[PDB]
């Protein structure tokens, strides 16, 4: 039988950075589809994109610098094989910003801030190479620490609804995880937001909490239906606060009612009710 974790959202983590979940939200009008490479798992527990099982791999990098380029590997030190994915597992997928990654080493002291621009021709994570930008030669492990407005195009605002270009002239060349579209008929995508450090009110959206992903990958429940009807339940009272649908590809939708999902409390629990058709019409929140 299909299940979701019996844990309040306020106690779980984002799947695109190791940050706690602070709110439920929907995308702005100008955001239709999203193609996040992290936080992607099917309802029967198949990981997609660069999604790892555990949060200790999320928004991290590992590689060897020679002063000019960082040759990437997998986080366990095994080689990264191109054309099996867009980047090594856990590689950050935050577009529309500059990355500031905290780099440490096994066997050595100190930490170093690694400033990453994701637009230059040097940035080719899909081929296993990114510009060192001053990081001295050696083997490092890094984790995303904070973000800032993208350096290029100059003056552009932070836009965390995008993924970076992993280094290609053709979209299909990078073997990305497919885009996620709103199903329509008033249904909008549901995103789990986290506050991200940086000089601004940065809110990082993701499609599933990381704890949901490891749960789905562990349970491997047969998707015996076309859509999963969910209830957002207050754990103290047990009252149903809103109907939701989870689609097999691994995302949640709802129909907003000014007062909607962004006004929902964050201490609730998603509970599986039954399998329904993809066109089951939800009651507005």
């Amino acid at each position: 039988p299909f299940t979701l974790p019996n844990l309040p959202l306020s106690s779980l983590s984002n799947s695109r950075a190791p940050l706690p979940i602070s709110s439920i939200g929907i995308s702005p009008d100008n955001v239709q589809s999203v193609q996040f490479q992290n936080g992607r798992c099917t309802l029967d527990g198949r990981l997609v994109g660069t999604t790892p099982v555990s949060l200790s791999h999320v928004a991290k990098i590992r590689g060897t610098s020679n002063g000019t380029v960082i040759n990437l590997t997998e986080l366990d030190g095994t080689p990264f094989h191109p054309f099996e994915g867009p980047a090594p597992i856990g590689f950050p997928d935050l577009g529309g910003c500059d990355w500031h990654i905290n780099m440490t080493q096994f066997g050595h002291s100190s930490q170093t801030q690694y400033d990453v621009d994701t637009t230059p021709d040097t940035f080719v994570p899909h081929l296993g190479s990114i510009q060192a930008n001053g990081i001295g030669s050696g083997n490092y492990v890094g984790v995303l620490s904070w973000i800032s407005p993208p350096s290029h195009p100059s003056g552009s605002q932070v836009d965390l609804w995008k993924i970076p270009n992993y280094g290609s002239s053709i979209t299909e060349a990078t073997h990305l995880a497919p885009s996620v579209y709103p199903p329509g008929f008033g249904e909008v995508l549901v995103f789990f937001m986290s506050k991200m450090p940086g000089p601004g009110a940065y809110n990082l959206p993701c499609l599933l909490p990381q704890e949901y992903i490891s749960h789905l990958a562990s349970e491997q429940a047969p998707t015996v239906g076309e859509a999963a009807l969910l209830h957002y339940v207050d754990p103290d009272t047990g009252r149903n606060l809103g109907e939701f649908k989870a689609y097999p590809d691994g995302f949640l939708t709802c129909v907003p009612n000014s007062s909607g999902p962004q006004q929902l409390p964050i201490n609730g629990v998603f509970v599986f009710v039954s399998w329904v058709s993809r066109f089951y019409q939800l009651k507005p929140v």
Partner: nanobody
Amino acid sequence: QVQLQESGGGLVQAGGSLRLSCAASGRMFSINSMGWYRQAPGKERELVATISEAGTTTYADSVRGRFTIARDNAKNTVYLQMNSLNPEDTAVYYCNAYIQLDSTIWFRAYWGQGTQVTVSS
């Protein structure tokens, strides 16, 4: 594939004029700023001129007044008209564009193959 092809360039006597063009082709969703960069022997690649999708211009101090950047958005082509060329303008010129491959993806910098401009003495 996204490709930037440059045309123009060549040899010209000091004081003469040359025109550069750059065509953008391939499957893409958006193009932001476009511009021209150059690299002379013994130096690094430096900014010459950039033009946005709206039409706002930026020029290097070394070419202000002589060079002019233009763009025909309908053809995704940026042009650089170089007048009053001197021997310090001798370099390899590169077209540059920040292109969005898809709606969901962030911009990436793309370059042309490079065009040689040689000013005689």
